[PDB]
Design a protein around this ligand. Structure first.
Ligand SMILES: O=C(O)c1c(CN2C(=O)Cc3ccccc32)ccc2c1OCO2
Ligand SMILES: O=C(O)c1c(CN2C(=O)Cc3ccccc32)ccc2c1OCO2
Ligand SMILES: O=C(O)c1c(CN2C(=O)Cc3ccccc32)ccc2c1OCO2
Ligand SMILES: O=C(O)c1c(CN2C(=O)Cc3ccccc32)ccc2c1OCO2
Ligand SMILES: [Cl-]
Ligand SMILES: [Cl-]
Lengths: 149, 149
């Protein structure tokens, strides 16, 4: 579980928000892109895997699952690429709820920035620091450190 | 402290590579930008602080230290903005040594990507996973986890 991430793609202001969630912790990383392509998805995964020990990625759709550019980035980064099918049905609604919460946070900071990408980074910050009593940021470091020891 | 980071700016192919180093571990995050403005530096720090518990940042030069955009982003993110003056004289050469090593790694992957930004992310990955026997990625998680606990 400590190396498992889920990709998620949501839309806002005619742009795409690409999200990776660390499944065990709820910790997230996100970027704004004009549209979801294999190339953008590949680049995002290279960034992610250089920062956290990404073992497995459940891709967000079949186009990223299929993409030769994505499969190449996963190979390069030592990531096992998986489908994102909610064999546990809980997952569709869990992603739904995350997007809705993320979009709520974005609405709360939207007026503090000109550009969507900036508001998204502020929302990532707020999400990751929110105490739930640990934050997502605390959980991920705890989970991975235990795994190393 | 587990919360201390140093900013560093280096040049390659007529572009700027902005680097944040976690002082205690040597773990790095980096991005390519056209040039080092207050705005770009501010956005890079918002990204960083959403991902790791950034308490203190030693800025890379006086323009970023002075920048009201940078000071506003530090205020927003709860970051203490400090100078990066080598009170330990060994800091100058340590940064120089990191840029040299980073550029060497970039040279080793340069032909595997069209765009500089991609090669820089591959280099971050290689740097952060390199053992010498823990990696920088292991050290940062271990340092912060101990700090939480
Ligand atoms: O509000 C949310 O549900 C939310 C989550 C939930 N999250 C976890 O805690 C574990 C997990 C696995 C797969 C998908 C989502 C989750 C995570 C991140 C969020 C959430 O709201 C905004 O950012
Ligand atoms: O060429 C680029 O800069 C680039 C790539 C290149 N690339 C692949 O197509 C497959 C792969 C695996 C590992 C590393 C790099 C690559 C991919 C994504 C990109 C690239 O520029 C921006 O987004
Ligand atoms: O080769 C390097 O010096 C290097 C470093 C060095 N680094 C640490 O290990 C701890 C530290 C504190 C302050 C500044 C630098 C360092 C870090 C990252 C690197 C390095 O080469 C490429 O990426
Ligand atoms: O307006 C933007 O999108 C933007 C900003 C905005 N901004 C400040 O000027 C000071 C600050 C503190 C906290 C959050 C946002 C801001 C800063 C940097 C940017 C921005 O767009 C891309 O790079
Ligand atoms: Cl493709
Ligand atoms: Cl400025």
């Amino acid at each position: 579980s400590p190396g498992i991430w889920q990709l998620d793609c949501t839309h806002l202001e005619g742009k795409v928000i690409l999200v990776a969630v660390h499944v065990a912790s709820g910790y997230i990383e996100a970027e704004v892109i004009p549209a979801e392509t294999g190339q953008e998805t590949a680049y995002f995964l290279l960034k992610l895997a250089g920062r956290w020990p990404v073992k497995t990625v459940h891709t967000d759709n079949g186009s990223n699952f299929t993409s030769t550019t994505v499969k190449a980035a996963c190979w390069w980064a030592g990531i096992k690429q998986e489908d994102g099918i909610p064999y546990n049905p809980q997952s569709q609604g869990v992603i739904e709820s995350m997007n809705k919460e993320l979009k709520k946070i974005i609405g709360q900071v939207r007026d503090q920035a000109e550009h969507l990408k900036t508001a998204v980074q502020m929302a990532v910050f707020i999400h990751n620091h929110k105490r739930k009593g640990y934050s997502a940021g605390e959980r991920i470091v705890d989970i991975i450190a235990t795994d190393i020891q």
